[PDB]
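Margin note: ligand = magnesium ion.
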Amino acid sequence: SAMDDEYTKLLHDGIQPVAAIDSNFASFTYTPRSLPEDDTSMAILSMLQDMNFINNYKIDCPTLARFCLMVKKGYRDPPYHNWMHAFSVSHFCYLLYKNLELTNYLEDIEIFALFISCMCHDLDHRGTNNSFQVASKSVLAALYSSEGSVMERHHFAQAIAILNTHGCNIFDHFSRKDYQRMLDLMRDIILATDLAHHLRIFKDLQKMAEVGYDRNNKQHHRLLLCLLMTSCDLSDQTKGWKTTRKIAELIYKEFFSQGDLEKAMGNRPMEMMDREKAYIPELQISFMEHIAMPIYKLLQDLFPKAAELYERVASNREHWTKVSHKFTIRGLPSNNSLDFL
Ligand SMILES: Cc1cc(N2CCC[C@@H](C(=O)Nc3ccc4ccccc4c3)C2)n2ncnc2n1
Ligand SMILES: [Mg+2]
Ligand SMILES: [Zn+2]
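Resulting structure:
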């Protein structure tokens, strides 16, 4: 059993200091995808420790070690929605904690729930979207299509299935009320990763940013958690151009594979999932403009120290404009051949 040996070391070796992971590990400039995948479960532990969640919530170490490994094992390997995505999304949550003073805004348990949700938020993704589940009449659509957010409901349900696995319930010593709270938070935060949900609450997010965050307003806590979750989920776009480029490759590999399947089903894919129609620079500019930039502008409005995140996203969008000409074939292809006609 690979997991068992991995568990043994994770549990008995000690939790590595977060600075020992990387000297800039707690910086917005750090790219968590740089971390070797073999090191990420230990890094999860290091972040949990550094945020003092292990001590504060008296988390049983053997349970926590099993839990983190089970979460890791609960991701498949599509090009984008794999464990390294969830790891990088969790890392950003950690960055938010280390850089933005979330304790002035959120309860301890809410911040804890946010991190755990980040770990779990894409569990068992198959690299297809919600519409595909319905179109392909998948088991997940049979379960959840009547409620919407099919994949996100599945991710949440997988998170709970891991909790309910013997030896993996990191919350099983919580009071009944705290346990109920935690799972309720996990539901809300994971469902909030449906970008359809984000677009639906965006005006409320705007209004909250307009009037000003009210720590006494329970709906403000819920809205902020949604915004932070989305911010973690899209946080690849806040890194350097190179990350942005690689992430685009991964996302479109995944999209186009879905598109191939939709064509094999007799359905016409979304333009952005059709490898014969998708024009990636324009698609990425649209995504940055209509989705990512507004999110990090909201985040900046709420947290002035997040300004650099927004400006980096704006920058990456500018870079798509500048490299777009390169998608037009000038001269001959590099093989000197017009055979592709
Ligand atoms: C970090 C990151 C994450 C991410 N998505 C996360 C959410 C689900 C997926 C999704 O809806 N993509 C979308 C959504 C809306 C779009 C609108 C116009 C043009 C393209 C669009 C692509 C992919 N994308 N998408 C592209 N670059 C990304 N970078
Ligand atoms: Mg998701
Ligand atoms: Zn995600």
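The first helix runs from residue 2 to 12.
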